[PDB]
Design an enzyme around this catalytic site. Structure first.
Site, PDB file in Angstrom:
ATOM      1  N   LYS A  78      14.605  31.100  35.081  1.00  0.00           N
ATOM      2  CA  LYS A  78      15.851  31.555  36.352  1.00  0.00           C
ATOM      3  C   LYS A  78      16.274  30.738  37.241  1.00  0.00           C
ATOM      4  O   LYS A  78      14.765  30.739  37.052  1.00  0.00           O
ATOM      5  CB  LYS A  78      16.112  32.912  36.833  1.00  0.00           C
ATOM      6  CG  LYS A  78      16.136  34.317  35.938  1.00  0.00           C
ATOM      7  CD  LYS A  78      17.570  33.650  34.600  1.00  0.00           C
ATOM      8  CE  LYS A  78      17.931  34.896  33.845  1.00  0.00           C
ATOM      9  NZ  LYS A  78      16.578  35.395  33.404  1.00  0.00           N
ATOM     10  N   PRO A  79      16.799  30.076  37.815  1.00  0.00           N
ATOM     11  CA  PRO A  79      18.171  30.049  36.997  1.00  0.00           C
ATOM     12  C   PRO A  79      18.550  29.498  36.089  1.00  0.00           C
ATOM     13  O   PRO A  79      17.876  28.492  35.955  1.00  0.00           O
ATOM     14  CB  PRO A  79      19.669  29.834  37.885  1.00  0.00           C
ATOM     15  CG  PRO A  79      18.420  28.990  38.886  1.00  0.00           C
ATOM     16  CD  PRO A  79      17.414  29.190  39.273  1.00  0.00           C
ATOM     17  N   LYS A  80      19.275  29.932  34.862  1.00  0.00           N
ATOM     18  CA  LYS A  80      20.066  29.883  33.654  1.00  0.00           C
ATOM     19  C   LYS A  80      20.159  28.348  33.765  1.00  0.00           C
ATOM     20  O   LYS A  80      19.073  27.710  33.568  1.00  0.00           O
ATOM     21  CB  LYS A  80      21.182  30.691  33.996  1.00  0.00           C
ATOM     22  CG  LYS A  80      21.020  31.045  31.806  1.00  0.00           C
ATOM     23  CD  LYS A  80      22.624  32.366  31.914  1.00  0.00           C
ATOM     24  CE  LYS A  80      22.126  33.484  32.893  1.00  0.00           C
ATOM     25  NZ  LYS A  80      22.607  34.476  32.134  1.00  0.00           N
ATOM     26  N   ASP A  98      14.849  29.914  27.313  1.00  0.00           N
ATOM     27  CA  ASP A  98      15.527  29.525  26.674  1.00  0.00           C
ATOM     28  C   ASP A  98      16.792  30.278  27.080  1.00  0.00           C
ATOM     29  O   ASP A  98      16.619  30.963  26.567  1.00  0.00           O
ATOM     30  CB  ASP A  98      15.833  28.442  26.618  1.00  0.00           C
ATOM     31  CG  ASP A  98      15.862  27.052  26.683  1.00  0.00           C
ATOM     32  OD1 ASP A  98      14.980  26.582  27.672  1.00  0.00           O
ATOM     33  OD2 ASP A  98      15.955  25.595  25.299  1.00  0.00           O
ATOM     34  N   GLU A 146      19.803  32.109  26.453  1.00  0.00           N
ATOM     35  CA  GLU A 146      20.528  32.318  25.384  1.00  0.00           C
ATOM     36  C   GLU A 146      21.973  31.817  26.021  1.00  0.00           C
ATOM     37  O   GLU A 146      22.193  30.646  24.863  1.00  0.00           O
ATOM     38  CB  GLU A 146      21.374  34.168  24.748  1.00  0.00           C
ATOM     39  CG  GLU A 146      21.719  34.352  25.785  1.00  0.00           C
ATOM     40  CD  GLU A 146      20.636  35.264  27.229  1.00  0.00           C
ATOM     41  OE1 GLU A 146      19.779  35.581  27.195  1.00  0.00           O
ATOM     42  OE2 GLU A 146      20.832  36.134  27.623  1.00  0.00           O
ATOM     43  N   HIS A 157      17.946  35.433  19.474  1.00  0.00           N
ATOM     44  CA  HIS A 157      18.194  36.351  20.794  1.00  0.00           C
ATOM     45  C   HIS A 157      19.788  36.874  20.345  1.00  0.00           C
ATOM     46  O   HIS A 157      20.150  36.908  19.744  1.00  0.00           O
ATOM     47  CB  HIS A 157      18.988  35.822  21.833  1.00  0.00           C
ATOM     48  CG  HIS A 157      19.703  36.089  23.466  1.00  0.00           C
ATOM     49  ND1 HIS A 157      20.849  36.560  23.190  1.00  0.00           N
ATOM     50  CD2 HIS A 157      18.219  36.941  24.290  1.00  0.00           C
ATOM     51  CE1 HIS A 157      20.770  37.593  24.385  1.00  0.00           C
ATOM     52  NE2 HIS A 157      19.330  36.990  25.165  1.00  0.00           N
ATOM     53  N   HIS A 209      25.841  40.855  20.769  1.00  0.00           N
ATOM     54  CA  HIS A 209      25.542  42.775  20.268  1.00  0.00           C
ATOM     55  C   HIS A 209      26.654  43.111  20.775  1.00  0.00           C
ATOM     56  O   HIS A 209      26.783  44.581  20.470  1.00  0.00           O
ATOM     57  CB  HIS A 209      24.551  43.038  20.105  1.00  0.00           C
ATOM     58  CG  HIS A 209      23.501  42.766  21.021  1.00  0.00           C
ATOM     59  ND1 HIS A 209      23.492  44.727  21.322  1.00  0.00           N
ATOM     60  CD2 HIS A 209      23.286  43.016  22.613  1.00  0.00           C
ATOM     61  CE1 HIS A 209      22.817  44.582  22.873  1.00  0.00           C
ATOM     62  NE2 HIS A 209      23.137  43.692  22.979  1.00  0.00           N
TER      63      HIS A 209
END
Lengths: 438, 119, 431, 431, 159
Positions: free
Chosen positions: E16-18, E43, E45, E135, E139
């Protein structure tokens, strides 16, 4: 310095590449210094001494200004003749020839303006180039077309047509008597018409027109693309469709891509129609740039079977580089812009393509000026016919063949042209209708 | 004519061709980061230079990353605080190289790196 | 005036905009000349579509102050005219035909507003300024390069010998001349081999990452890619292309290869002055520079009047560039996070020009010292050291708050006191 | 005389010229014989072209002094007759048919003027003399090689064992015999593996770059390239081809592969004496040598009467070779910077021949010592050392200004005083 | 067995950050995480290839972080290099470079990439010795509500 690069008693070698620059020096710069600067800054010029020069013999790698003289053209202009050694240039690379000669010198401060007018390409260099994939005579034999200029039409509107409506216009033009129709130089692949859809419908038009008339038909399918991979992909599908001719914008696409496409076309039997888009950015102004005859010689080396060559409606300059594009041996003739005797040692010629405001009344002048080995392209000269594309094509084919017949009989086209056309109007209502509006 | 040395002058990029920086000259470089609103950070290593052990593809080198000393000194306004941390690292790792780096939150990159200590 | 002069047309955010410097023929009003520029660069079969959707339109005309019979014509081109990701087609569409129109005595394309909608269809630079700095672990100063001279005449081995001495003295890069591709007496693969040995010997000796712009410019795209492939096998960080003489179709292909394979791409602008030198006709370099950033490159030669250079330097490097006629920026340019290109300064520069170059260009630049390195009386390694010392002396002084514009010569003289290499350089080349 | 005897024709700079030694049948005048050579090696359908553009023409005839009924016929062939870059087609065009003409009792092609316009369509040597010296870091002396004997009969391992001992003693190269390709009891890949181990063991031990001419001569081009590919994977510097028995089409293909992959190409002239031995009929070796330089090779076997050898040695190595009938050079030959080929001397030579070989050939040569190395009473490494010592003793003496022609035996005897290896060599082989 | 890890849960950390970090600063974070005792970094998603951090640049710097931390600690390290892409060609291209770098594990968002692509990538990882971190992004669009959708156990058996 001057006597390192201004060598007026130098005798050019048969392996030298010769250049003729039109140089406009800055005020206070004498002609001998401008001439030495053109040669130096297009070869081995350095602003400070480097010890690495002692590891070689630089005089064998320098360009030499061996002659400079004023020209009657505008203020303070001269023609500087430069000789470049053969070892400077990568074999088979127009890209390296341009880089080596025009890559740097045009930005030199002491030169207010600079224009490359001509190049003498020696046989020892030109033989490292494939040249046209086929050339004038092979093309005539492949198409079974002899004894007259070929005829083409540029499909309009340039952009905005669907692929199918594009092919519909092509079929109607071809079925009326034209040998070719033409993708616009801007027509590559766009949201209004994707290239593979155009190739499909244009192929149907080619074969429908050919089956109806019994003459071989073509449409310049534009393979110009953003990457060499896309360009070859479009050529590959044209090969699969089995059509005779594709097209490339050689200046905007570039010489590296164009030479690759020319090699593909030779390997797969495709004729290569070349458009000179963006040439006027470079070749318009008398004082700065590169004359079109230089870009025309470069296309013949890199490879093309047609090249657009402009209009005649200045003529002697146009006739000069037409000869440079078509002939095997062209004698020096500066009145027509030919600064060097040019020997092509059997490299095939390129068919020049005349285009721009041409209609039926110009057919006598065009046939007389260009002769049989040309393509005459019509824009509104076909599509603007009041009866449509097929009667418009018929009018142009009739007008051309009446000119060819009269010329073959020994008649004077430059003086009897209007009466030759008017006489043909009598038995061709299609031609008569064209001559009533133009 | 003098011959450029072949050994004993291995380099650490920007400012490493200057003579060894005094404390006052080091402070001036640190202040430059603070004035520029960049975040100073210390980095240390017992290996001073790049190598290619795990791969040799274009743009891959080992030894570019060193080890972070603590964290970037966010909100630092006193350049002498950076010096105090430099001296701390010299005490804990006297046989390690120490360089000062800088981060910018605006262009979102590291934009500074200069050697501060050699063992 | 015609259907092509629409002086109250509101540009769309997807339009490609162009600023032409138009010089009409005698007796051609600027309104008529401007409509012709829009028409000649765009548009019974016309009844099968809507021509107003595909026409370029001149939406604004203004005079050039201080030049008689010169006007700036602004033209808007719809987004649908252009093939995605093809600079070749953008040039073909806009400059393919209009420069030959008889009603225009002269024509120069000055600028292009590349809308984010179009630029997002281009990969852009293989890496760009920030990635390149991270890959090479270089921060806080301009990079240093040197073109090997003589251009041609050296063996491939003697060529690489010069490269090693240059790099070991403090330079980041050495450079193949734009003319150096493959030639008799120095074939490209031999040069790549010896230059590779020089790259890694100098890197092992100094501890800093080194590179050499290995020129992949070729006669065909096949040859061009073949040369980039061997550079990839050798594991070197950077290759080079002459994008104008090679061409955009080849340059975009090479840029894609370098992105796929981690290679930096140094771009030389050979033959640009054929096009961009005369104020009255051609295309300004800033147009050729935007085209290169879109087609793809990590460096681009930018030369060494200063306000115009700063203008297209910003257009090459920055994310968002506001309009600024004083610096030749006719359009606000939003690159929506397309990386920038490092401008490369060259042209008879030496140690005394380091203060001016450092202040003018800033850190995000490459300074190229050909004769300024190979002309040093002690050889290439001391000449590189002189240049590297002069640069870091300038960087140190700038970081300290000093004014490189008025203290530059004092800063160089001060570094002469402890660097015999720089002192020798400063003796042959004068301030 | 006919339309083919044109005694005042002025040769073109693009013409390929040939010098034939013609022996006419009884009752055939030399003028008639010369016209037949031009016609039989060149030319209603004739009305569809111009035959005079495509005919060979005999432009000069002269007698051979000291031989009755022998004449030199000079013929000019237009450039358009030949396929670019194809030695196969040049041979087919010139020697494909005329040697069987009944009016000619015998025919020998002595020389060929290869115009720069034609030679520039050929890649030529993959590297050539100067590149090879730079790649191998070897300067200032002839190189040394040794063919492994016995030809066949050794295991692949014992074969490579011999190579290692030879190379570690001072030789630059060992050599696959021209007959050694792939055979029962020594398959090629096994030989390549063990010879590779010998190359790198000897190189690590001595510090000098080593090589082995790995023979890639094969029954098909696919097999030939497969063998060069594995040599490339092993990273070795040189491979080998029998260009006459393999053929020019295969040799040019292999030469292209070696250029693309950095391999030196050692060329053996096996079967040349079938063609070039008899003075009255065939093709002189200088013609086969020019063909090899055009088709491509970095070494070529040149044998060990001396003026004729010096003649084609210059034709193999130099850039520009002026006509010299005393040395069999019938035409001025301009190679316009095509690299030269290193001539390889072989044939029962040993340490006592080192002064003569060094003076006659100069530095740019390979001296091959098969039995002269493997026949040393102490083994391969002392035999190599004896040869390397004898050579450097000769080089040192030549560099000092001494006359190797009159002091050679004294120079060898002097080196015997301190090199027991050479002394033992000089005891079994006599001066 | 491949990782020589036994007798405890493995430890990972998503960077993080993404988005917002350079590829180098991203890998810098990975190295410090791994050298402290974590087995994996990850990493996000969402992290595929984006402006300011293209995937190949991230793979290069993360590879340097993997091997620096492994040499320092002596334990085998990895980073879930996300190969999720817009096309299967791009997806396989990213797994291929991870293979060239010699790293132990890659990653895929199997629900948003899709099963046809996930099975293709799983075959590639089997053929090339790569571990595949999966990942389950998106979902909860399907499995959250008790009354409608598909329970996660069905999506888990499918994976």
């Amino acid at each position: 310095y001057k006597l390192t690069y201004y060598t007026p008693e130098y005798e050019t070698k048969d392996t030298d590449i010769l250049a003729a620059f039109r140089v406009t020096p800055q005020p206070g710069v004498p002609p001998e210094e401008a001439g030495a600067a053109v040669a130096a800054e297009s070869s081995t010029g350095t602003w400070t001494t480097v010890w690495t020069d002692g590891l070689t013999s630089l005089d064998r790698y320098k360009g030499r200004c061996y002659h400079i003289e004023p020209v009657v053209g505008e203020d303070n202009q001269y023609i500087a003749y430069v000789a470049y050694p053969l070892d400077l240039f990568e074999e088979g690379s127009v890209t390296n020839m341009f880089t080596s000669i025009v890559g740097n010198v045009f930005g030199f401060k002491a030169l207010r303006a600079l224009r490359l007018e001509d190049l003498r390409i020696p046989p020892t260099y030109s033989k490292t180039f494939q040249g046209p994939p086929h050339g004038i005579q092979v093309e005539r034999d492949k198409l079974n077309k002899y004894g007259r200029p070929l005829l083409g039409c540029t499909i309009k509107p340039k952009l905005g047509l669907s692929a199918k409506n594009y092919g519909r216009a092509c079929y109607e033009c071809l079925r009326g008597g034209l040998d070719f129709t033409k993708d616009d130089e801007n027509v590559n692949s766009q949201p209004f018409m994707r290239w593979r859809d155009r190739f499909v419908f244009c192929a149907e038009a080619i074969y429908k027109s050919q089956a109806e008339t019994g003459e071989i038909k073509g449409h310049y399918l534009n393979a110009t693309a953003g990457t060499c991979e896309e360009m070859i992909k479009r050529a590959v599908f044209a090969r699969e469709l089995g059509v005779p001719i594709v097209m490339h914008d050689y200046l905007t696409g570039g010489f590296t891509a164009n030479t690759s496409l020319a090699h593909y076309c030779r390997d797969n039997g495709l004729l290569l129609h070349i458009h000179r888009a963006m040439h006027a950015v470079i070749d318009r102004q008398k004082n700065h740039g590169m004359h079109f005859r230089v870009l025309a010689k470069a296309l013949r080396m890199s490879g093309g079977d047609h090249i657009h060559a402009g209009t005649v409606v200045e003529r002697e300059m146009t006739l000069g580089f037409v000869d440079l594009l078509r002939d095997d041996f062209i004698e020096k003739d500066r009145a027509r812009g030919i600064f060097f005797t040019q020997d092509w040692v059997s490299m095939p010629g390129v068919i020049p393509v005349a285009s721009g405001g041409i209609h039926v009344w110009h057919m006598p002048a065009l046939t007389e000026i260009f002769g049989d080995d040309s393509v005459l392209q019509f824009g509104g000269g076909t599509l603007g016919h009041p009866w449509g594309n097929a009667p418009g094509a018929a009018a142009n084919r009739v007008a051309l063949e009446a000119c060819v017949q009269a010329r073959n009989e020994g008649r004077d086209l430059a003086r009897e042209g209007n009466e030759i056309i008017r006489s043909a109007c009598k038995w061709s209502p299609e031609l008569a209708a064209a001559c009533e509006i133009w | 004519m003098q011959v450029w040395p072949i050994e004993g002058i291995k380099k650490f990029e920007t400012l490493s061709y200057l003579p060894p920086l005094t404390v006052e000259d080091l402070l001036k470089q640190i202040e430059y980061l603070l004035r520029s609103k960049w975040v100073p950070c210390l980095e240390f290593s017992k290996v001073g230079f790049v190598y290619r052990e795990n791969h040799r593809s274009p743009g891959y080198y080992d030894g570019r990353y060193w080890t972070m000393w603590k964290l970037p000194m966010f909100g630092c306004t006193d350049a002498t605080q950076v010096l105090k941390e430099l001296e701390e690292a010299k005490k804990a790792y006297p046989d390690a190289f120490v360089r000062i780096i800088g981060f910018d939150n605006v262009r979102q990159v590291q934009l500074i790196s200069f050697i501060a200590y050699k063992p």
